[PDB]
Coordinates of C-alpha atoms in Angstrom, one line a residue:
Chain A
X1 CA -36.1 -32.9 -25.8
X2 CA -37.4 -32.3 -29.1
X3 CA -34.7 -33.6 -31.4
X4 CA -33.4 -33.5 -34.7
X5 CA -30.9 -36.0 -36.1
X6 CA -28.8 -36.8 -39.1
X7 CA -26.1 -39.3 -41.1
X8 CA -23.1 -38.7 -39.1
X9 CA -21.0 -39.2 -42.7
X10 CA -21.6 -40.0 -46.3
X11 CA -19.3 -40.1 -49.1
X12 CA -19.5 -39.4 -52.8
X13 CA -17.7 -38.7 -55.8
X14 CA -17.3 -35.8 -57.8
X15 CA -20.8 -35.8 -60.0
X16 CA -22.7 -38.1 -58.3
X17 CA -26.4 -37.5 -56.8
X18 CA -26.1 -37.5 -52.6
X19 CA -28.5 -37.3 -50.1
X20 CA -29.0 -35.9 -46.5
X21 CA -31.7 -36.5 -44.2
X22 CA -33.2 -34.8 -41.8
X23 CA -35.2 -36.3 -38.6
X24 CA -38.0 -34.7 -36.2
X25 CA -38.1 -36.9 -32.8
X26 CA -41.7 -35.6 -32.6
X27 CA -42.3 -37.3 -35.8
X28 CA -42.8 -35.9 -39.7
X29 CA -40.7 -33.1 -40.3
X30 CA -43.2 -30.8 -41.6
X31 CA -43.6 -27.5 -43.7
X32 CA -44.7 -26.2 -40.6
X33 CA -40.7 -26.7 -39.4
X34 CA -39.3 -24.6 -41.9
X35 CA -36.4 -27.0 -42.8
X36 CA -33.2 -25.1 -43.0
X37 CA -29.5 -26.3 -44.2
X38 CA -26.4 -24.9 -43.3
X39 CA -22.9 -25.6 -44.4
X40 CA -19.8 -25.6 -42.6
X41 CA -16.1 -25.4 -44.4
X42 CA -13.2 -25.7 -42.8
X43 CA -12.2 -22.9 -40.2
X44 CA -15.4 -22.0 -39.0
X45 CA -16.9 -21.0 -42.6
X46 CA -20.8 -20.9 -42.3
X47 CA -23.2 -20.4 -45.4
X48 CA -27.1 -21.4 -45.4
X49 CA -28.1 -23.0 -48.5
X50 CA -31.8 -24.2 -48.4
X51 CA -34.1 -22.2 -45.7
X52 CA -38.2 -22.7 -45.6
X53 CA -38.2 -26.5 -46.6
X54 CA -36.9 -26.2 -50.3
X55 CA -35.9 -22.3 -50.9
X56 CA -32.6 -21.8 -52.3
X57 CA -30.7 -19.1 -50.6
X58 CA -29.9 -16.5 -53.2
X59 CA -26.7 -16.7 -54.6
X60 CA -26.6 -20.5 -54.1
X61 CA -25.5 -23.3 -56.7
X62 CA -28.6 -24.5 -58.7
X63 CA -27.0 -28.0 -57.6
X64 CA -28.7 -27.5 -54.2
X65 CA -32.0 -28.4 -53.8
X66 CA -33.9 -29.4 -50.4
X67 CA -37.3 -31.0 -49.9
X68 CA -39.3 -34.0 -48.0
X69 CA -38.7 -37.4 -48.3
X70 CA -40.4 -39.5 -45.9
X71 CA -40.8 -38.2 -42.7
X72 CA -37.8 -36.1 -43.0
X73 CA -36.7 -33.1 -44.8
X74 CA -33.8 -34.3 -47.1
X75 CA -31.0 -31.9 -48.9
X76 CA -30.0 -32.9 -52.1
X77 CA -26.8 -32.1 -54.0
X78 CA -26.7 -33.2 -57.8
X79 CA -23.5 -33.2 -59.9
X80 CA -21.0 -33.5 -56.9
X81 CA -18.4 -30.8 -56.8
X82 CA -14.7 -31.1 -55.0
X83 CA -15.0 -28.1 -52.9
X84 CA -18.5 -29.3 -51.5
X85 CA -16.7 -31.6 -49.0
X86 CA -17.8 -30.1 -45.9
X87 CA -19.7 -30.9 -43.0
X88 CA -23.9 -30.2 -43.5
X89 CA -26.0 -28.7 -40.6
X90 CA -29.7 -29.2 -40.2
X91 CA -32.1 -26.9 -38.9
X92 CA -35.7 -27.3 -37.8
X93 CA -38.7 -24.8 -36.2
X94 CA -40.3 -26.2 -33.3
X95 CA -43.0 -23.0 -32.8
X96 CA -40.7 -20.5 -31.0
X97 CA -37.1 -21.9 -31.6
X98 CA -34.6 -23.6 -34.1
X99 CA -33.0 -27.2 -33.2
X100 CA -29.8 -28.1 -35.3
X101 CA -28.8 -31.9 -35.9
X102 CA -25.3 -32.9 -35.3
X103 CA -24.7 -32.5 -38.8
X104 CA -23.5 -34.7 -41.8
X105 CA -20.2 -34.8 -42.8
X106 CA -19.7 -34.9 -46.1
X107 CA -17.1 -36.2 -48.3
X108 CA -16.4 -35.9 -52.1
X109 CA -13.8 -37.5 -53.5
X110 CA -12.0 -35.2 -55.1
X111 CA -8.6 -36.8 -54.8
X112 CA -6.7 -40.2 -54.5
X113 CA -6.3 -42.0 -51.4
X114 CA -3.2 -41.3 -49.6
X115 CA -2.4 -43.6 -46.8
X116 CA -1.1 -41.8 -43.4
X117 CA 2.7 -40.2 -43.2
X118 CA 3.5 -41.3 -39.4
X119 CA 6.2 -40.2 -37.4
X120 CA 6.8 -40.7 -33.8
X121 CA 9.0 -38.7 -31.7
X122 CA 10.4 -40.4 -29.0
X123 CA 10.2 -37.5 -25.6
X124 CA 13.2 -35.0 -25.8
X125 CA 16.0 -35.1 -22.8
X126 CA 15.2 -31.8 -21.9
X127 CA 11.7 -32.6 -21.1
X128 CA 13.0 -35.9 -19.5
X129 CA 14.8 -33.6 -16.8
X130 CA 11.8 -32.1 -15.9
X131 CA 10.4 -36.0 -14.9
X132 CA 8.0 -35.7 -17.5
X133 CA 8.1 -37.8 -20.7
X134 CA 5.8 -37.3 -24.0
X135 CA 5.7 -38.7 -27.3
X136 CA 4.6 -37.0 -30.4
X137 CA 2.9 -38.4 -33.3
X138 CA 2.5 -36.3 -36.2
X139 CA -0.1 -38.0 -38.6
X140 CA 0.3 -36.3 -42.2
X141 CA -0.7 -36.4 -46.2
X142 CA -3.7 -39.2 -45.8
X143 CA -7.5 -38.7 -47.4
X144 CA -10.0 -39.1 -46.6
X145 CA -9.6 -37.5 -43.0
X146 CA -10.3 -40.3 -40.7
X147 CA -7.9 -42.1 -38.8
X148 CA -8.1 -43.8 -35.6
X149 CA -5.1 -43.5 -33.2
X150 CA -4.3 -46.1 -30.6
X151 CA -1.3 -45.9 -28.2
X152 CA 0.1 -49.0 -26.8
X153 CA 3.0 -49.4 -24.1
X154 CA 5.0 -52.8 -24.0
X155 CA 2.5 -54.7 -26.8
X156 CA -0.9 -53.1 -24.3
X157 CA -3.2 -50.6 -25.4
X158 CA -3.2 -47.5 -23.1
X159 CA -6.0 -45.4 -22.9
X160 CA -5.1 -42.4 -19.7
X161 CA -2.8 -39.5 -20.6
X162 CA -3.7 -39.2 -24.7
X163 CA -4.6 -36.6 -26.3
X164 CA -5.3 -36.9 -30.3
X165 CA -6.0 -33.8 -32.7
X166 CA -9.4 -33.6 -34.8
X167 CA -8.2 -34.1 -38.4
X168 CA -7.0 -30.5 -40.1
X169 CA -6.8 -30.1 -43.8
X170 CA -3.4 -29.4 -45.0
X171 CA -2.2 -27.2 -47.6
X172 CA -2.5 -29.8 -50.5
X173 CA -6.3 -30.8 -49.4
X174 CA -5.0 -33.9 -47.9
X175 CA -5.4 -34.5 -43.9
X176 CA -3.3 -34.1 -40.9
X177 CA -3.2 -34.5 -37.1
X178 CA -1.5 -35.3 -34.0
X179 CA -1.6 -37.6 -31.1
X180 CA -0.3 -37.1 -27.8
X181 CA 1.0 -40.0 -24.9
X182 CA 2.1 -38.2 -21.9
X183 CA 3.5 -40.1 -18.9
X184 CA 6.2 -39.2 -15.8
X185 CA 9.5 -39.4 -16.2
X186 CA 9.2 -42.4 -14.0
X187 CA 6.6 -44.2 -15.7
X188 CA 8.7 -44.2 -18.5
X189 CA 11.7 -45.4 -17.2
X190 CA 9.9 -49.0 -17.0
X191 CA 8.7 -49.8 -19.9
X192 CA 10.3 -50.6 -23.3
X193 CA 8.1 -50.9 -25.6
X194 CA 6.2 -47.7 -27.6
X195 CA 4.1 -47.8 -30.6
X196 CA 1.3 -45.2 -32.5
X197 CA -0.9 -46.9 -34.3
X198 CA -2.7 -45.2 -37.2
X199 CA -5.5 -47.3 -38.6
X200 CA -7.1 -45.6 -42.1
X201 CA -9.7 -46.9 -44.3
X202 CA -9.0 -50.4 -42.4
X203 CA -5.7 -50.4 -43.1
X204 CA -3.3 -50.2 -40.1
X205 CA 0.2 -48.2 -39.9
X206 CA 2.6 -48.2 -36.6
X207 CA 5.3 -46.7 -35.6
X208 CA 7.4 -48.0 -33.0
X209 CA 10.7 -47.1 -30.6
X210 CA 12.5 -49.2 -27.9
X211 CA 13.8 -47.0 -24.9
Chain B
X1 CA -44.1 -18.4 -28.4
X2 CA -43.1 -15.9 -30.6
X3 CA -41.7 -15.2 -34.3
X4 CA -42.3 -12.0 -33.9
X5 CA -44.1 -8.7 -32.3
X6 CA -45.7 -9.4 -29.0
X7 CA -42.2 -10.5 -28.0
X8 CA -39.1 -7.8 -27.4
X9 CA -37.8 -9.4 -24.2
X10 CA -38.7 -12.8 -24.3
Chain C
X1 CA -19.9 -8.9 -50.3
X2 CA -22.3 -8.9 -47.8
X3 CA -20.3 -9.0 -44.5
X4 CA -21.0 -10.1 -41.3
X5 CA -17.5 -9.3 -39.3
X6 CA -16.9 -10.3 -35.6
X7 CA -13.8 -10.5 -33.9
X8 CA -12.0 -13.7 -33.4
X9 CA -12.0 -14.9 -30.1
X10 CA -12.6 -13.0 -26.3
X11 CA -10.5 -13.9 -22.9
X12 CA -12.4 -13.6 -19.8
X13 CA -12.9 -14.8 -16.0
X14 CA -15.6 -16.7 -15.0
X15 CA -18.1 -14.3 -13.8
X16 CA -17.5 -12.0 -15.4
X17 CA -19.8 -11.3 -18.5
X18 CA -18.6 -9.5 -22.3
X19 CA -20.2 -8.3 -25.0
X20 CA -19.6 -9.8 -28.2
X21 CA -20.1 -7.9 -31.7
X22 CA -21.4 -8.1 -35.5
X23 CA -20.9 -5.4 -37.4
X24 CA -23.0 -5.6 -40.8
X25 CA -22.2 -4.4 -43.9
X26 CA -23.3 -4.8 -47.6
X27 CA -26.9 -4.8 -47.0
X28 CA -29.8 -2.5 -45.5
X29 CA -29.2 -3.6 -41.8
X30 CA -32.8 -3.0 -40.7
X31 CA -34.3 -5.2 -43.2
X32 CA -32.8 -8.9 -42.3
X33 CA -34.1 -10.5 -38.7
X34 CA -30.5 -11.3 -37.0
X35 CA -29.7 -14.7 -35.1
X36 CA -27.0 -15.9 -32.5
X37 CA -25.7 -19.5 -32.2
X38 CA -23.5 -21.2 -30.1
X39 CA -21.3 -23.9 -30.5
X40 CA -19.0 -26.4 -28.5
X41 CA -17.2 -29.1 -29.8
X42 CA -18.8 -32.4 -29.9
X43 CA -22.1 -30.6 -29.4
X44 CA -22.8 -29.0 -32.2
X45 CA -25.3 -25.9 -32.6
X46 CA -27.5 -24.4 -30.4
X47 CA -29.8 -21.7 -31.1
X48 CA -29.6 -18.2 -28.5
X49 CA -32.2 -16.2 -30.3
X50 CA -32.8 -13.5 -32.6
X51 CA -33.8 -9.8 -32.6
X52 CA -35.5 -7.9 -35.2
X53 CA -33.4 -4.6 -36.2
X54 CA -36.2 -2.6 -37.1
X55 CA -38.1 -3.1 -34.0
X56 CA -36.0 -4.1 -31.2
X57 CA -37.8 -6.7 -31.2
X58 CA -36.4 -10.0 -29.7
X59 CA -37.3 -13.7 -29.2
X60 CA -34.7 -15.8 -27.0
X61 CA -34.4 -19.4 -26.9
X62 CA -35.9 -20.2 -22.7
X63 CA -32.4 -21.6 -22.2
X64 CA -30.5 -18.6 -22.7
X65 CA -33.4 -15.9 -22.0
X66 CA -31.5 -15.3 -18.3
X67 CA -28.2 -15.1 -19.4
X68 CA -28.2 -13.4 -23.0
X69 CA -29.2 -10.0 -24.0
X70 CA -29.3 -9.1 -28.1
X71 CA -29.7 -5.5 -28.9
X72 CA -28.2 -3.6 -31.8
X73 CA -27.5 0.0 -32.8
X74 CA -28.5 1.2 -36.1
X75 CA -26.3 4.1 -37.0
X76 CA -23.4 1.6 -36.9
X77 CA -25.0 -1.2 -38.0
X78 CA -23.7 -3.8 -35.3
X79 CA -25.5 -6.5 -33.5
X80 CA -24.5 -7.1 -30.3
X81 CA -25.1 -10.0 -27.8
X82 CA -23.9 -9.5 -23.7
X83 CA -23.2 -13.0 -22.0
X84 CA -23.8 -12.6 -18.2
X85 CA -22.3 -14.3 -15.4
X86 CA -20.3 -16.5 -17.0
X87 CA -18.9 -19.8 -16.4
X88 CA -17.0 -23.0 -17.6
X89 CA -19.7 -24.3 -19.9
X90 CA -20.1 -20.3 -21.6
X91 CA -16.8 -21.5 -23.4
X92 CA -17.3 -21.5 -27.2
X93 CA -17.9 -20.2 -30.6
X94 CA -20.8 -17.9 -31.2
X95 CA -22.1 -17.0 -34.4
X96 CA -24.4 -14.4 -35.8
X97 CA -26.0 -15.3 -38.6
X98 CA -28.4 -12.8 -41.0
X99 CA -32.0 -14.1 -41.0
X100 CA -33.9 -13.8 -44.5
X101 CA -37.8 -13.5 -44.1
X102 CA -40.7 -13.6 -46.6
X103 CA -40.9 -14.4 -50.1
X104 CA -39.4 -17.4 -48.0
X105 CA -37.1 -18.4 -44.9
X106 CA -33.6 -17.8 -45.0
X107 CA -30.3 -18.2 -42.9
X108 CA -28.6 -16.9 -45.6
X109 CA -25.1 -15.0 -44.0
X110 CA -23.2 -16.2 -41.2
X111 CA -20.1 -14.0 -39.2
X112 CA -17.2 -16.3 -38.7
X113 CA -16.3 -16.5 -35.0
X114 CA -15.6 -16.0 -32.0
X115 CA -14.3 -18.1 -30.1
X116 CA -14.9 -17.4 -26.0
X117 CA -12.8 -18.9 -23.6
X118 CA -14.1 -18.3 -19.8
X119 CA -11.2 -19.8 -17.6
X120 CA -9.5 -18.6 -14.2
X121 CA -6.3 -19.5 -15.0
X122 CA -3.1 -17.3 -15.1
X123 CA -1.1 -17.0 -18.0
X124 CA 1.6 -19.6 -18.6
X125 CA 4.6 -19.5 -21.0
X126 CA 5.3 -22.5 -22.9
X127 CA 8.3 -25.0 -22.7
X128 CA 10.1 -25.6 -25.8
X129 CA 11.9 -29.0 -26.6
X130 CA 13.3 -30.0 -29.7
X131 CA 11.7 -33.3 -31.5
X132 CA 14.3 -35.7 -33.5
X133 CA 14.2 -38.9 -34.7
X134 CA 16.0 -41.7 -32.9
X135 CA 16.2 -43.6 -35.9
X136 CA 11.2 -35.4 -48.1
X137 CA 13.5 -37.3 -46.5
X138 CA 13.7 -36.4 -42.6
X139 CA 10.9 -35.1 -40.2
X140 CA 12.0 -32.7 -37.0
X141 CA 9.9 -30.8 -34.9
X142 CA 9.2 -28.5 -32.1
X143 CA 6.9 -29.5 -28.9
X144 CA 5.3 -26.5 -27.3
X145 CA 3.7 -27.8 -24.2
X146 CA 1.9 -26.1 -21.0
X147 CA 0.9 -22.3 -22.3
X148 CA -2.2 -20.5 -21.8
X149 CA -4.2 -19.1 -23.2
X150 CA -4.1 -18.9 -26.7
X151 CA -2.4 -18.2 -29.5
X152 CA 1.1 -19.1 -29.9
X153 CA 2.6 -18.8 -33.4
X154 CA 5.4 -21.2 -34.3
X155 CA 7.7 -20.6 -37.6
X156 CA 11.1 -22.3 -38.4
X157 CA 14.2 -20.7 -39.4
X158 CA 12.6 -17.9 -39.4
X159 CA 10.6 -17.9 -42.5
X160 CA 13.6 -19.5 -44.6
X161 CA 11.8 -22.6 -44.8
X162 CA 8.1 -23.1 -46.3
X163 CA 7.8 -26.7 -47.2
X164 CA 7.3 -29.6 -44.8
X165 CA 5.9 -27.3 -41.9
X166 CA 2.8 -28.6 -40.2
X167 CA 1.6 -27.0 -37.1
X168 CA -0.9 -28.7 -35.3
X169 CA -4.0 -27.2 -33.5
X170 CA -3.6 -27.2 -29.4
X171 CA -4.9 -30.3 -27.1
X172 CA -6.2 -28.7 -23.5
X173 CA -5.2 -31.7 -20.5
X174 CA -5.0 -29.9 -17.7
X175 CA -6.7 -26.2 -18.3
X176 CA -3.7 -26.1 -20.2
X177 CA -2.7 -25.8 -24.0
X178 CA -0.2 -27.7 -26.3
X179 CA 0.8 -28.6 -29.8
X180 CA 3.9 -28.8 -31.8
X181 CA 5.1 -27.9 -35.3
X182 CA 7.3 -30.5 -37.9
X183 CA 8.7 -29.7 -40.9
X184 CA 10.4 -32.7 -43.0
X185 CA 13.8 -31.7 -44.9
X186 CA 16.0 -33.4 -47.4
X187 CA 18.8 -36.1 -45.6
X188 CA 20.9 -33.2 -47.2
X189 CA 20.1 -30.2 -44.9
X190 CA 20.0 -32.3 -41.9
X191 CA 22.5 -32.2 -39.8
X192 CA 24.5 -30.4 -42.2
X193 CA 22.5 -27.1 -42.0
X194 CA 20.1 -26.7 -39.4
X195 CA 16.5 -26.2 -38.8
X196 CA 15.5 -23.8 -35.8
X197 CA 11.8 -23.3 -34.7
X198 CA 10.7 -19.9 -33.7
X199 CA 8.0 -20.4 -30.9
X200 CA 6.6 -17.3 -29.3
X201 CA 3.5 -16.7 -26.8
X202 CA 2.2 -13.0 -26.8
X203 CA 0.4 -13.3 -23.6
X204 CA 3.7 -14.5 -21.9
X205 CA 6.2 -11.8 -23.8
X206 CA 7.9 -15.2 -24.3
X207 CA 10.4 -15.9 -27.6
X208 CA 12.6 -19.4 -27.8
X209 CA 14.5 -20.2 -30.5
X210 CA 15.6 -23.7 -30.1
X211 CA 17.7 -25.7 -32.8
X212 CA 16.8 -29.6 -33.2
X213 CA 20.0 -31.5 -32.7
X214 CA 21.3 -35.3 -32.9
X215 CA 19.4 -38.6 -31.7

């Protein structure tokens, strides 16, 4: 149970000074831990930037720099750039093996803020002969990427049978993703009332069909 | 422990 | 263009056990310590172990010492990593990633994949049903639910459209994939000219074409 932890999220804009932090649960992260940060882009893109506490992995922006503040080991980016919007992974030597944190996930804003583009899809006949009903919404064009979906049958929140899609960057840099509401054919038949709610950067969309 | 030589298999 | 290349994703049954790759190139292979991770969404990382190229010489993490083997072959410059009786929790990504030592520490390179998926169930062809409104200018789209196992590829009328398309990654209820597609269109093509998605699973030898019509 030796754990490391980090800042779930941050955001920043495009040439400002950020900071991520690193925490040892066995107490001050040491040199002794060998401090090591790792990016993640989208689609499973990996590259280490800072290994040994503050050396900068060749071939590495001079805007990277790592180090110890505190009690932790801390990465610092200076002079904010667009494309460093990505999620940062923390790495720490415990004497004979590495512990990663959960990772920070970074956001520069590199962009305007585009509300959600919700659709819902109310479930096809064809599926509705099978006694089987689902409703699609597609969640498109909104930055930053996180929204919080809620489902609710007939006014009340449902939470059995949804299924909701991590947010995946679209072609234009802005975010998309889809929820799911599945139910029987039956089920379906008895309510009247369907709505997807889409709630970004506290503001709240719906979208909503009578059978 | 390791980090290196006395350790190939473990 | 140092490369760390590793194919994209594996299909196997559990207990069974494969034998994933990284073939190196760009660099002098026996030089650079190598290192496997493993990841699982809403986990994170996890660290499997590394093995030095020039001596053989390996150092596994206790929790994976029993069920992974690395080893390498330096004529081809390929590290390889052998998961052994494999189960439901075995499902994920595994990385290798190129280990700089001295001068400093370094995890310098990672490879970009592979994504395992250890399930026992049979392949299953999707069903295709056509999403319309029931009331940039109108949204359609294609619902391919129930296939497995991955991928499916989903393209509308046939490449003739480009704009508006937005196929969604695959939700898993039920051991069991789905996702769907939309692509938005001027009031103008629709319903005067039609949009048609082209769904197709590999795995399944399975090809529907299904046009989205009035609600």
């Amino acid at each position: 149970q030796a754990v490391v932890t980090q800042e779930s999220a941050l955001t920043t804009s495009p040439g400002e000074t950020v900071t991520l932090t690193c925490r040892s649960s066995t107490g001050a992260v040491t040199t002794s831990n060998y401090a090591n940060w790792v990016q993640e882009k989208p689609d499973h893109l990996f590259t280490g930037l800072i290994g040994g506490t503050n050396n900068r992995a060749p071939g590495v922006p001079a805007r990277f720099s790592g180090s110890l503040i505190g009690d932790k080991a801390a990465l610092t980016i200076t002079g904010g750039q667009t494309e460093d919007e990505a999620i940062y992974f923390c790495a720490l030597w415990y004497s004979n093996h590495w512990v990663f944190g959960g990772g920070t996930k970074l956001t520069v804003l590199g962009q305007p803020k585009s509300s959600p583009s919700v659709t819902l899809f109310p479930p096809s006949s064809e599926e509705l002969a099978t006694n089987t009903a689902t409703l699609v919404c597609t969640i498109t064009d909104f930055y930053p990427g996180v929204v919080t979906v809620d489902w609710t049958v007939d006014g009340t929140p449902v939470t059995q049978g949804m299924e909701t899609t991590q947010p995946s960057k679209q072609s234009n840099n802005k975010y998309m993703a889809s929820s799911y509401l599945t139910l029987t054919a039956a089920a379906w038949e008895r309510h009247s009332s369907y709505s997807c709610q889409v709630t970004h950067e506290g503001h709240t969309v719906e979208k909503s069909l009578s059978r | 422990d390791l980090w290196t030589t006395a350790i190939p298999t473990i | 263009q140092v490369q760390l290349q590793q194919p994209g994703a594996e299909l196997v049954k559990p207990g069974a056990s494969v034998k994933l790759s990284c073939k190196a190139s760009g660099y002098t292979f026996t030089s650079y310590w190598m290192h496997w991770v493993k990841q699982r969404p809403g986990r994170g990382l996890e660290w499997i172990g590394r093995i030095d190229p020039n001596s053989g010489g390996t150092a596994y993490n206790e929790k994976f010492k029993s069920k992974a083997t690395l080893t390498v072959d330096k004529p081809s410059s390929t590290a390889y990593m052998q998961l052994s009786s494999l189960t439901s929790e075995d499902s994920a990504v595994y990385y290798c990633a190129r280990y700089d030592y001295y001068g400093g520490s370094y995890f310098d390179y990672w490879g970009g994949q592979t994504t395992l998926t250890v399930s026992s169930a049979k392949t299953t062809p999707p069903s295709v049903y056509p999403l319309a409104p029931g009331s940039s200018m109108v949204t359609l789209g294609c619902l391919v639910k129930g296939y497995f196992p991955e991928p499916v590829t989903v393209v509308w009328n046939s490449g003739s459209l480009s704009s508006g398309v937005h196929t969604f990654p695959a939700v898993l209820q039920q051991g069991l994939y789905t996702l769907s597609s939309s692509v938005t269109v001027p009031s103008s093509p629709w319903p005067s000219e039609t949009v048609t998605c082209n769904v197709a699973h590999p795995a399944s030898s399975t090809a529907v074409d299904k046009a989205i019509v009035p609600r």
